[PDB]
Amino acid sequence: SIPWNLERITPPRYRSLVEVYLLDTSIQSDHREIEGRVMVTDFENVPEEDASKCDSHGTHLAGVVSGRDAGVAKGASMRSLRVLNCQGKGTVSGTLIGLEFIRKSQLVQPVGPLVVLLPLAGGYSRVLNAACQRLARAGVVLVTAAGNFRDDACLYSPASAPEVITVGATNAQDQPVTLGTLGTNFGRCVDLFAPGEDIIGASSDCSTCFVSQSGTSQAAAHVAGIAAMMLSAEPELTLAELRQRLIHFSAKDVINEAWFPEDQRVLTPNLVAALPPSQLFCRTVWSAHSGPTRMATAIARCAPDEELLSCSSFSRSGKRRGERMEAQGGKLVCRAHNAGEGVYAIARCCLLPQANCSVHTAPPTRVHCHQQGHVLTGCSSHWEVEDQPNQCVGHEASIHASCCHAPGLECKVKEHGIQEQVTVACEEGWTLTGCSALPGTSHVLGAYAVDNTCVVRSRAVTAVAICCRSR
Amino acid sequence: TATFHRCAKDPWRLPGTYVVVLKEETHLSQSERTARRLQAQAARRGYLTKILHVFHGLLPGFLVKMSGDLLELALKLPHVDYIEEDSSVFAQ
């Protein structure tokens, strides 16, 4: 009965003050799916084309967001801006002006939370990413398509833009959409995936007609609908709070990552979006590569309202000198060191309100968070040349422990000792705040959190996971 | 100090139109005077320019239609942060 995509975003247990802006082709605003709940702003900025095809793309996506029978947020209020011409093509300048139009609308007649859907992409653009960042820092939520070229989303905009939610597309088999050379983009600039193939929605052929379309835009429209409902339940949510919820309520580890290029499987989130049913949120943040200098560093950072509770590193070469946490501009940052083709820094960023956190740098039977009422959330380690719950273990290395002020918090340390991949997982109800390896027979290539699972890669071996929960 | 940028995907570039971005604290009046200053210096050199839009609200700056030959002139203008050649976006 129910279209597959709407059933897939429904959680296994399940029970309007928000406006959704759409930057797209023209819309067939009187289509019965969306009639009455989409306001055409008649802003228009499109290049000239080098009638039912004209509004095909936009009408379908408005339906996916707000449609009465096949929408995600049925009844959600929308406003549309035309930035794509009848051939589906626009400009960065027109998109800039349209984004500026949204901000001027908000300044003239303020409303509630604003979700802006950007179902479009071009190459990496410095100015487009800067404008999305400023719109986001002004309180607007931006949701963008990852792109349709089976490529790294970091090479496209606004997909690569900082404070936006970038969404790739999966199909009915939870596998990434592919069409020969085309298919969903991937990589560390994608935040999550969503149903994006064979998505039924409003067809601009006729007022009651339906068509099946596919795209990372369709996937992003699912996330824009989920976000709109999340913001109606919690209008005070910040962007970092909303992104942490989207991740937390996603389906985990359902995507066959073999479709992605090998170097992109660790960087690409294995998440398929889902509505919430009817607490400590953490997320893994991957940095860009560092380069093959012996002093080359890589830096992963958190959102302004997020705490950095741990920091690890990974090199496929295995030639790495560890990682460390350090302040930069009044904020803790995850720095990783090359020995070696290069390394990634892997941050664990968490929403912990009513909590002060610190770094304690010391050698590895002592305790590294010695203050009272303080828990150890992460144990980093770095060394200079190339060869008991609140303490960090290590061999010549220097420890960087993250210690948090948190009266309502409880943390427990679980290791697992045994090879290319050892994993230990937090228990259900616990949040993985830190993931590290203990050196042994094998040479550790690195460690990283995958949701609440600590993963250590080698070439004994013990994975060490620090799990916390608000009691 | 001021830099130029254009899209790495050659078939997506739109030469002839440029987004002149100014430094963050630039007021809208300075943005408009910088653009008319560019128009004036371009006219002296025999070039025709058209200011298509002036930006304020998110980033200060303006959209200009002009020959690329003017880019080193425009990069020397006061308050300029960077200039970017317009490029294409597509329905995804």
Partner: peptide, 10 residues
């Protein structure tokens, strides 16, 4: 798959 973003999908 439609060219506004023709092939069978799914």
């Amino acid at each position: 798959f439609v060219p506004t973003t023709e092939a069978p999908c799914x």
